[PDB]
Nucleic acid binder design. Sequence first.
RNA 1: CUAACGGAAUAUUUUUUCUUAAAUGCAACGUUGGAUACUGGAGCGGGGAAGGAUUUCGUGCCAACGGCACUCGUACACGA
RNA 2: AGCGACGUCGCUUUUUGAUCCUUCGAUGUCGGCUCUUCCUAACCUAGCGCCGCAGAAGACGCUAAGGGUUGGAUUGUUCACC
RNA 3: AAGAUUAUCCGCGCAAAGCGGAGGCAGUCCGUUUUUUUCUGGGUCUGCCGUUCGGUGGCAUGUGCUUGGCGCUGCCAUCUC
RNA 4: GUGAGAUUGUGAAGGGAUCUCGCAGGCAUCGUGAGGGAAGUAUGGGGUAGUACGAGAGGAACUCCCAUGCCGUGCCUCUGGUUUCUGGAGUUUGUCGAAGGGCAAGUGCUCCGACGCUAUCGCACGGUGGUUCUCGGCUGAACGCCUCUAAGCCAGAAACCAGUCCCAAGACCGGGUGCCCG
RNA 5: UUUUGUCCCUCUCCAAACGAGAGUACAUGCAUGGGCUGGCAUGAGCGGCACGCUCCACGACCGUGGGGCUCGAGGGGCACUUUACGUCCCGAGGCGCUGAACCUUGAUGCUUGGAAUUUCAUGCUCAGGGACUUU
Lengths: 100, 188, 360
Amino acid sequence: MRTIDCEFSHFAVHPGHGRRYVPFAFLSTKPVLTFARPKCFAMYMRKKNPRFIAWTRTYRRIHRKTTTDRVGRRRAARTVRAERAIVGAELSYIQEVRAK
Amino acid sequence: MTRAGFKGKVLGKEKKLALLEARKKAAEARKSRDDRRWKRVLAKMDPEKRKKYHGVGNTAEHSRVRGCTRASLFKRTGRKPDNIVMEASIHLSKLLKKRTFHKRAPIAIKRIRSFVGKLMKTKDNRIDASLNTFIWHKGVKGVPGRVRVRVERKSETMEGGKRKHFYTVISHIPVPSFKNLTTKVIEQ
Amino acid sequence: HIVRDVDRPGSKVNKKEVVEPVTILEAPPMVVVGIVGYRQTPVGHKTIGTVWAHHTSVEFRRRFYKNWKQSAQLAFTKRKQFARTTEGRLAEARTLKAFEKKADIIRVVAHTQLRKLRNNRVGVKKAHVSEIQINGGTIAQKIELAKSLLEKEVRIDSVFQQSEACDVCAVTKGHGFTGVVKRWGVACLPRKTHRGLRKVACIGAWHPSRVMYTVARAGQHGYHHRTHLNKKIYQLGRAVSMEPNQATTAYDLTAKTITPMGGFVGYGTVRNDYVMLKGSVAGPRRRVITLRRPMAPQTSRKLTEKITLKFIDTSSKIGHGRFQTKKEKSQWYGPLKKDRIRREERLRKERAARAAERKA
RNA sequence: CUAACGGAAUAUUUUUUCUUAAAUGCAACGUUGGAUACUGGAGCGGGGAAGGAUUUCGUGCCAACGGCACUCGUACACGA
RNA sequence: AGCGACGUCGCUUUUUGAUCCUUCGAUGUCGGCUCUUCCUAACCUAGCGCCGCAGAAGACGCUAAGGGUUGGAUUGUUCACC
RNA sequence: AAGAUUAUCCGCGCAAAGCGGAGGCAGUCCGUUUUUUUCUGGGUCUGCCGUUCGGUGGCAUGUGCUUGGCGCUGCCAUCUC
RNA sequence: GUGAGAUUGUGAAGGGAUCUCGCAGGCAUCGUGAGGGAAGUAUGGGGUAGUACGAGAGGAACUCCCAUGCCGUGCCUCUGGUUUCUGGAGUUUGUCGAAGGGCAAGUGCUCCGACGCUAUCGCACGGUGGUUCUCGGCUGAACGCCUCUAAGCCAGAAACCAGUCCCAAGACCGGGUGCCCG
RNA sequence: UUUUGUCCCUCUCCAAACGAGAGUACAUGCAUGGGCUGGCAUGAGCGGCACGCUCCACGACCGUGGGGCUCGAGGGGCACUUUACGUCCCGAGGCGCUGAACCUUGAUGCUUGGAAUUUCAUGCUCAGGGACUUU
């Protein structure tokens, strides 16, 4: 078990499949990046822009392609906002705090 | 797993199936009918007995009779190909593979004729000029890989060389989605 | 490839999860159709008797006729009569008597149900048979058993239980007429190799002029029987569940199929039950293959294993393996120009309108 | 490549009555049209020199012959 | 142990010589590459005997040819040689 | 092959010894008894009567399996032989 | 010892072929293995143990256990590699009034590329019997002692022989079965 | 007659032989070819204040409305707002027009292609044998 996601693509790399490089990383450490189809490596190498690459995870994300209606919608989750008491108090203290 | 716990369905099938099977099983009289024909038939060849004698079908007959009856209808009881026009769609992919850029297409042409015979089961192919161009559209190397015909097996009187007497025209006609689209048989 | 856990007494890779290549082999039942006694004579096995089916199916006949074609199928028909011969030859009495009396290897005549529930590719729909020796207590007991199993059907599990090493007999994958090189592995000469190259320098001596055989030459390569040993059965399958299902694969947690996204070229198959063997397999693709009991005692770190699958990854392959499960895959794109919403929604009402109209 | 034409583009079989079908010829070779290419002007083009000289054309015509082959010709034949 | 002088017989023929049988109306010269197989006078491997083998290490011998038996450098090589 | 065994059978049983099991009926051609012991045979044709089968159908059920179809058995009955 | 009948046969007052003749074959199927061939191989770890051994210096060994090699032999999930899938996509030059969209460019040209192939650049797999070798022995007479030795006998090596594996039994092996024959 | 072979026909076999099969016919063989699986990687086309997109809704397929989002520029220049022709901007400037756009984004994860030897359907079509050995 343990699927890495081939980053670039993002795609879950099941236990087999694909190939693995170890990069450097100082703000964390030492990663491994796993690439799926060398097509994914090569493009990477070819230093294309994930922000425009069709096939990437980026590309959907950024691009209208993920966007709004599918899952990015906000301001619709359940809530309650309403007027609240002290808790552990007679009615007079609750009036006194709220009032003046 | 199409039954279990989907209660009582069981009795229903076992019997129901009991008919369809029975019916199927039942459904013919067979080979010896033909052996009554054979002793005579070895005395010399009768195809009007033969094309239909050659086939049978016991699980098909509410549906096979549908395809068989047309085709039996001029053809399996006494041959006699029409004289038909159909318009077709062919898959060049298997066809164009491998061998030489420089030969695939002429050979395709030959093959086109051949398919046509193969199709018309009943042989001989004349081609429309358009097709001719259509083909040589690039000229060898490539060709367009999907073709749209209107083909007519048409009947002829006594004519021509070799073996002539029945004949075909096959023609281009176009508009893609060929691989979806289908061929259809042209009502006459 | 499959995932399962490592361990042994003191291996390097003990305690690891591992991922491994495995094979899948289509399986349903063979049906037992005869019993055979060959007896050992001081000249080897000579068959002494053969015991029968009493009902003879068409396929098996199709093979049991050299063909179907125009086949009148008339084989077995007299044999077929023999139910009468309950009141008639108690052949069974004689056979058995012989068996007891003399038989020395018992083989069972079994043949396959050869549609295998497969659809298309491949064919040889003719049908197939083979003798199977049965070993394990007492001729009679065997026999009884056999006898009991006459007409009865076999599932692999009845002779197996998985984790097991079994042995294999198969025909090589074919290569036709072969470059001797592939056939034997010789090494060339330079670039300056006048008058050809593959065809190596030294092949016989003056003495002995008699061309030696420890040289070979080209020829067929592949298409051989080979009788290969030690293939572990890693799993024994059953009952394809439905309108899409069977599998379930633990950590799959999904209830998948045991079929890849592709699931074998020309062979999108899995059409019954399977044998999962660890490792790969001989021969040409798409072909029938013979499992035989292992002969090695197999005592091993390997046998002696808790190989007890967990989990199997189940790629595509075909187009490349890129996104496990069409299910997953489907998600990722989800919506697209097709269907979906902007066509399916239209479709749902449209469909609804048509459906309603035809009924009313 | 193709359609067409034109040559001895010639045939076929028989139960059946029989004929389409179901099994090979023709002529693999001509042309005209058509369709596709190629050369790629330092031409496979177009013109001399020597060389050749009837090979030219017309008409015919097809045994050999042109290493296939011709129903085509620098062939033959017959003339021009 | 292991040797082995002085002797003194062996033994072999992947040496080298001698001999000219044969071969000149023709048996294609080097080397090397490749490639096989074979031989054993076993280098390594299996297993025994000895040890001037404590261990250690080597040595000696047997039984053994089934199995194994290298990359360069330089050098046409061969041999040579690191 | 099982005894130097061809006669109304088989089965069983080393083998003994022994055992069991073993259809009929009429009509029909031909004719012996004899590997030293049938004993009426032989021989076909029919007829006539009945386990089995074989088929027919049905009813349950068991079994088994796909694009719910394919595949097969119980029993029953029928049918036929 | 020595048929017949048919079929069949031809060049000479007839023979014979052919077939089929007092018990034919076909087909099919399934089988046995003679006999042939025949393969694995060594070093590494763990460990023993820093133990033995050694006074020290130093400094070993098996099972056992894990491995690995090379070799062999399979294989393609994966990965790699391979691309005339003229597959996609991309690009130049030219080429088609004209975009489109094709073309040429002797596979124009790149990037992508399944599949298939395939790589120790990928993945898998490599059986236990016998007889002996030396050799040691055991017993043990000769030879009143003794001796492995004669007799007898035990045990025995990477050797050989088989199992297994690869061929399929005599151009002339045969068994078992289905169905048609005669 | 029993055939097997051969017409017929498969790709696993495959140099050829040979092989392996085969249909033998219906949830078939068979192809159209469906579906569907891929792959490559957003078409042509059209559009940029409209239109697209997106949300909601109605009509539910639709028409349609609403809401929201969206709501791309570099150009040599040139006309015309006049004689009353109500153009009722008279110039400022505004409105357009005016050869090419270039890239872009959008509709579009598009578009497009997926066999030789892909996956399959509760799709479609088509059709299913000539020979001859021959006992």
